[PDB]
């Protein structure tokens, strides 16, 4: 077997490659964090805007809190995060609300 003897890479070359990879991963992580922060702002605006509905609707139903002893269904935490369709619906609803906000 022709054992292709790979040339010895200087530790300087390995160190520079590691630095480049770290810079690339930092860029990726900063982009991800910016996206997540934008999504955080969008969802915070959505929740605050609908809290008027949340507050208005919660107040109305407080007096209706009867003797309902319905067994509490065990929904896994994986179902408390918006799916693709729900995330798109939230994004479109907030897009429309924001467009109305700019208009007004």
């Amino acid at each position: 077997m022709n054992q292709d003897k790979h040339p010895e890479i200087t530790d300087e070359e390995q160190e520079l490659i590691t630095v480049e990879e770290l810079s690339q991963k930092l860029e990726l992580l900063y982009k991800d964090m910016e996206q997540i922060r934008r999504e955080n702002l969008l969802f915070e605006a959505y929740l605050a805007r609908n809290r008027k509905e949340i507050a208005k609707e919660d107040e109305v139903s407080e007096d209706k809190k009867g003797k309902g002893k319905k067994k509490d269904k065990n929904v896994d935490k994986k179902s408390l995060l918006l799916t693709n369709e729900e995330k798109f619906e939230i994004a479109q609803q907030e897009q429309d609300a924001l467009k109305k906000q700019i208009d007004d």
Binding site: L42, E44, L47, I54
Partner: protein, 99 residues
């Protein structure tokens, strides 16, 4: 041993550079985790609100809308919010000038 140390220029051999990159990546990861917590709490609140207000029926049988389309609409939302910001900026500028 005082004079000879000054001119010792810090020629980082990618080791201090590696450490700085690692610390920056750790800070980015902590910010990412904070953004994860914020987004997850916001999504949980949004989902509970949608269950409480909109119908619990899920329209998964529809055509598979592209998550690329969802990201396009999210970027459009970010752009529209920024444009709102700058538009009110100019509006206030001209209003104050007129006043």
């Amino acid at each position: 041993n005082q004079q000879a140390a000054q001119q010792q220029q810090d020629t980082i051999s990618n080791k201090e550079i590696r450490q700085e990159l690692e610390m920056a990546i750790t800070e980015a990861q902590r910010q990412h985790d904070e953004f994860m917590l914020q987004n997850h709490k916001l999504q949980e609140e949004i989902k509970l609100l949608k269950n409480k207000n909109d119908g619990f029926v899920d329209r998964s049988n529809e055509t598979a809308m592209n998550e690329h389309k969802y990201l396009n609409t999210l970027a459009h939302v970010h752009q529209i919010r920024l444009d709102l910001k700058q538009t009110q900026t100019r509006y206030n500028q001209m209003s104050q000038e007129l006043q």
